């Protein structure tokens, strides 16, 4: 039989059967209602378009992201996410395969029960396991020690794990990135005349957040060469034909990740949450959290990541401490390659959630 | 029995049975009373002459177009238009056929109501639907996206539709074309000494507006070769036997369509109403409003369009944006071939206004 690794990604939900190297389906999670008068006869339309189709029919719909600060807004849209994914993307019956689901490292209750229960009664899954996204990135990297940085649009997390136990008193949740980085980029993109106010227009901002934005080596010195008239500015092209040229704001927006003063929020940067979680761990283990710092999520692919984070930590940490930050190719699919490695392993398969146990004990013993 | 497609044109009402060729009866809406005393007695002639006998017996009558600025002058003449077409052209019973009527995109309330209500109570049709004249040209052209140009004597319109929704905030109505081009032609025909002024006499001007006039490619450069002593004159023959030679004024009159300062009205050319409506639409859709510009109506049958319109848009439009214009053969009957395609389709017959529903709720829910 076949098993399915399905990641409830922040962006960028990822789905694909076990092995060999990639998700079969990746999509930007948006659901979109029709916001204008439909005058055509027929009409040949869907009641609501999900992604990909909601990313090829922008501006005639009203985009609704179904996950907001790590909570899924309603299961009415969520069941349609699931159904769409299984039937017209993966092309599989849920009863066919035991599944693998992902969750958040720090989340409220009740969100793992309600998921497990609704998916068991609605889609009639035969067995299930639900993993937090951070744990899976250890399997992908081949590590069993380290602080895990799982960063997606828009909840990041900072989890310390040591061979092979979790440190409860050192776990930090930042709501700092990344949809708020999108929202900030749109707010400092107003300075260059072309505005992108609406929900639909925000997706275009995300494409300029991917490609053109970059993290610097040091803020003060990038501000210095920005003052120079020699152009380091980059020209983006807009679907109507227009060319938008951004320069200084290009490195100002991502710098927010190490300087939350741009949002003005009271929370501290990835720099300091790394230090403050390490300096709340036991003395012996602090040695091996340094050099096993493991990054993940699509948002960590910027040029100055990890060597900004490195240079800043090496300055605050004691003299001659060995610090190297683990940055593998294609981090956006790291989590999925984790799940892929995990569910194939012998043998405590007999620690999963299964229909027979669910029949007697329901959605209890899930945390 | 079989549905009847009758389009309440701007000009130029068109009427014809369900498909597939062209309307059975077309006439330019004129009613005309006899303006001189009767002396032969009896006398075998009507109280007011309808077409086509009112276009042969010109000069003994006072011609009155009943559709003025898109408003119908009174239902006394309108009911007579209807009665004359159904009885004395088509030879059809209104009680027998579900009918299909058209109206304008932006026009005053309650002129679609009062029309629908009078046609149900006077002619006792069994079912009816009222379509805006522009939407039907999409079905005829075989597309479902684009800005629709329905241009007739005396009201043109600019409606943007995107697969298959309509933008309420982007609809532009010009009262500029075509009867004011007729009036301008009549004022510059005085320039060659022919004093043409009367209501009847205006019709002959309309025929010279069709055949002899031509749209240029660049005004200043068409004026340049006009400035050479060599002829630009074309010779028209007039019913009394006279030969009229127009040349210079020949390209001056149609140019009014892109140069409305010739009339002196504050409104801007089809060029600029296209651009200003497209750049009032949301960013993503703007790409496909370009290159799916769809022309229609008899007044667009000048050979110098669409490449005047093309060259003008290409001058204002951003670089690298493709511009193509959808312009079929026989554009005057585009709308009618639309109506034929529409009313023949299943299953939207149960979205028509039917006699039972009209009896139940009167002239409500028409829009
Ligand atoms: N090259 C890139 N540079 C910066 N951000 C990127 C890049 N590619 C993708 N992203 C970001 O990755 C985000 C998706 O995060 P995701 O990987 O889904 O997080 P997670 O798996 O933890 O939920 C997107 O919202 C997008 O902005
Ligand atoms: N070859 C032509 N060149 C220019 N004008 C034309 C030509 N053929 C017809 N027309 C014009 O078309 C007008 C009718 O427009 P029409 O298409 O009937 O308006 P509508 O679309 O709103 O019903 C007439 O008044 C006539 O002057
Ligand atoms: Mg994550
Ligand atoms: Mg028309």
Q: N- to C-terminal Cα distance for chain B?
A: 26
**From atom 9 of ligand 2, which residue's Cα is the shortest distance away?**
B298
Among A41, A237, A242, beta carbon nearest to B348: A41
Cβ-Cβ contacts under 8 Å for B339 (sequence gap 6 or more): B5, B7, B100, B102, B131, B136
Residue at token pair 């009262």 = B175
Measured at the alpha carbon of residue B303, what is the angle toward residues B302 and B306, in degrees to the nearest 5? 90
SS3 B193: coil
Q: Tell me if A241 and B166 make a contact (CB, 8 A cut-off).
A: no
| Residue A146 to residue A129: CA distance in whole angstroms | 23
Q: How many CA atoms lie within 13 A of B24 on its CB side?
A: 16
| Residue B78 to residue A87: CA distance in whole angstroms | 56
Please check whether the domain covering B1-30+67-130+333-367 is classified as CATH 3.40.50.720: no
Task: Output the CA–CA distances (angstroms, integers) from residue B361 to A303, A311, B108, B112, B229, in the order listed.
Answer: 67, 76, 22, 16, 70
C-alpha of residue A171 to centroid of ligand 3, in Å? 15
Q: Counting every residue, how long is chain B?
A: 367
SS3 A90: helix
Lateral strand order in the sheet of A31-34: A49-50, A31-34, A61-64
Cβ-Cβ contacts under 8 Å for B23 (sequence gap 6 or more): B5, B7, B14, B15, B16, B333, B336
A133 lines ligand 1 (CB under 6 A): yes
CB A332 within 8 A of CB A297: yes
A11 lines ligand 1 (CB under 6 A): yes
Cβ-Cβ contacts under 8 Å for B241 (sequence gap 6 or more): none
Q: N- to C-terminal Cα distance for chain A?
A: 28
- Chain B residues lying within 8 Å of A201, measured CB to CB: 282-283
**DSSP code, position A88:** I
CB B286 within 8 A of CB A239: yes
- Tally A–B CB contacts below 8 A: 69
| Residue A33 to residue B355: CA distance in whole angstroms | 34
| Residue A186 to residue A188: CA distance in whole angstroms | 6
B138 to chain A: closest CA residue: A40
Q: Which two tokens stand for residue B100?
A: 């299909």
Contacts 24+ apart (CB under 8 A), B218-225: B218/B311, B219/B255, B219/B259, B222/B251
Nearest to B100 by CA among B286, B341, B307, B274: B341
Q: How many CA atoms lie within 13 A of B204 on its CB side?
A: 21
The ligand 2 atom at the shortest distance from the C-alpha of residue B150 is 21
- Ligand 1 pocket: which of A9, A12, A133, A300 to mutate (most atoms <8 Å of CB)? A12
Measured at the alpha carbon of residue A191, what is the angle toward residues A203 and A243, in degrees to the nearest 5? 60
Homologous superfamily (CATH) for A132-177+267-328:
ATPase, nucleotide binding domain (3.30.420.40)
A157 lines ligand 1 (CB under 6 A): no
* B142 burial type by CB count under 10 A (0-12 exposed, 13-18 middle, 19+ buried): exposed
CB B33 within 8 A of CB B359: no
A12 lines ligand 1 (CB under 6 A): yes
Among B162, B164, B286, beta carbon nearest to A43: B164
- Ligand 2 pocket: which of B5, B8, B11 to mutate (most atoms <8 Å of CB)? B11
Distance, CA of A215 to chain centre: 18
Instruction: List the domain boundaries for chain B.
Output: 1-30+67-130+333-367, 31-64, 132-177+267-328, 178-263
Q: Counting every residue, how long is chain A?
A: 367
- Chain B residues lying within 8 Å of A44, measured CB to CB: 164
CB A172 within 8 A of CB A289: no
| Residue B49 to residue B43: CA distance in whole angstroms | 13
CB A203 within 8 A of CB A63: yes
| Residue A235 to residue A211: CA distance in whole angstroms | 11
User: Which value in Å is the resolution of this experimental model?
Assistant: 7.6
Cβ-Cβ contacts under 8 Å for B340 (sequence gap 6 or more): B5, B18, B19, B20
Backbone φ/ψ region at B133: left (φ over 0), alpha (ψ -120 to 50), beta: alpha
CATH number given to A178-263: 3.90.640.10
Backbone angles phi, psi at A360, to 5 degrees: -85, -50
Method underlying the structure: cryo-EM
Q: Tell me if B164 and A239 make a contact (CB, 8 A cut-off).
A: no
| Residue B26 to residue B11: CA distance in whole angstroms | 10
- Residues in a beta bridge with A129: A100
| Residue B9 to residue B123: CA distance in whole angstroms | 20
Cis, bond preceding B154 (omega within 30 deg of 0) = yes
| Residue A49 to residue A79: CA distance in whole angstroms | 14
The ligand 1 atom at the shortest distance from the C-alpha of residue A206 is 27
Q: Tell me if B166 and A36 make a contact (CB, 8 A cut-off).
A: yes
Please check whether the domain covering A31-64 is classified as CATH 2.30.36.70: yes
- Chain A residues lying within 8 Å of B345, measured CB to CB: 41
Q: How many CA atoms lie within 13 A of B181 on its CB side?
A: 32
For chain B, how many helices (H) and strands (E)? 13, 20
Q: Which two tokens stand for residue A75?
A: 């299961």
SS3 A151: strand
B202 lines ligand 2 (CB under 6 A): no
How close is the nearest chain A Cα to the Cα of B144, in Å? 8
A55 to chain B: closest CA residue: B284
- Chain A residues lying within 8 Å of B287, measured CB to CB: 239-240
A178 lines ligand 1 (CB under 6 A): yes
Q: Tell me if B283 and A59 make a contact (CB, 8 A cut-off).
A: yes
| Residue B63 to residue B78: CA distance in whole angstroms | 15
The ligand 2 atom at the shortest distance from the C-alpha of residue B7 is 23
Q: Tell me if A238 and B283 make a contact (CB, 8 A cut-off).
A: yes
| Residue B210 to residue A292: CA distance in whole angstroms | 82
Q: In terms of DSSP bridges, do strands A4-7 and A99-103 run parallel, antiparallel, or are they unpaired?
A: parallel
How close is the nearest chain A Cα to the Cα of B229, in Å? 44
The 10 Å Cβ neighbour count of residue B268 is 17
Residue at token pair 């200084």 = A248
How close is the nearest chain B Cα to the Cα of A246, in Å? 19
Q: Which two tokens stand for residue B91?
A: 């030879």
Nearest to A329 by CA among A289, A300, A292: A300
Q: Which two tokens stand for residue A3?
A: 């098993």
Task: Output the CA–CA distances (angstroms, integers) from residue B118 to A256, B122, B358, B365, in the order listed.
Answer: 68, 6, 12, 16
A210 lines ligand 1 (CB under 6 A): yes
Helix, strand, coil share (%) of chain A residues, nearest 5: 40, 20, 40
Quick check: do B132-177+267-328 and B178-263 share a fold?
no
| Residue A139 to residue A341: CA distance in whole angstroms | 6
Among B285, B287, B348, beta carbon nearest to A60: B285
Most B-contacting residue of A30, A33, A35, A36 (CB-CB within 10 A), to test interface:
A36
Backbone φ/ψ region at B362: left (φ over 0), alpha (ψ -120 to 50), beta: left
């Amino acid at each position: 039989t076949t098993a399915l690794v399905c990641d409830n990604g922040s962006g960028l939900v990822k789905a694909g059967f076990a092995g060999d190297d990639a998700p079969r389906a990746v999509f930007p999670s948006i659901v979109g209602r029709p916001r204008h008068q439909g005058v055509m006869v027929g009409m040949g339309q869907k009641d609501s378009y999900v992604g990909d189709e909601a990313q090829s029919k922008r501006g005639i719909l009203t985009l609704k992201y179904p996950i907001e600060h790590g909570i899924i807004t309603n299961w009415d849209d969520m069941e349609k996410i699931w159904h769409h994914t299984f039937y017209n993307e993966l092309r599989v019956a849920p009863e066919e395969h035991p599944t693998l689901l992902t969750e958040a490292p720090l989340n409220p209750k009740a969100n793992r029960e309600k998921m497990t229960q609704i998916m068991f009664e609605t889609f009639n899954v035969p067995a299930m396991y639900v993993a937090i996204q951070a744990v899976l990135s250890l399997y992908a990297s081949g590590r069993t020690t380290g602080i895990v940085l799982d960063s997606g649009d828009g909840v990041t997390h900072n989890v310390p794990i040591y061979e092979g136990y979790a440190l409860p008193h050192a776990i930090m949740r930042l709501d700092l990135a990344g949809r708020d980085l999108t929202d900030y980029l749109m707010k400092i993109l107003t300075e260059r005349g072309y505005s992108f106010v609406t929900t639909a227009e925000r997706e275009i901002v995300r494409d300029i957040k991917e490609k053109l934005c970059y993290v610097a080596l040091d803020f003060e010195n990038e501000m210095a060469t920005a003052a120079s008239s020699s152009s380091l500015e980059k020209s983006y092209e807009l679907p109507d034909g227009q060319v938008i040229t951004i320069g200084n704001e290009r490195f100002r927006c991502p710098e927010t990740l190490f300087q939350p003063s741009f949002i003005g929020m009271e929370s501290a940067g990835i720099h300091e949450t790394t230090y403050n979680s390490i300096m709340k761990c036991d003395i012996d283990i602090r040695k091996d959290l340094y050099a096993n710092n493991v990054m993940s999520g699509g948002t960590t692919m910027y040029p100055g990541i990890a060597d900004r984070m490195q240079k800043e930590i090496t300055a605050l940490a004691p003299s001659t401490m060995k610090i190297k930050i683990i940055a593998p190719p294609e981090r956006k699919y790291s989590v999925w390659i984790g799940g892929s490695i995990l569910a194939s392993l012998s043998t405590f398969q007999q620690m999963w959630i299964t229909k027979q146990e669910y029949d007697e004990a329901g959605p209890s013993i899930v945390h």
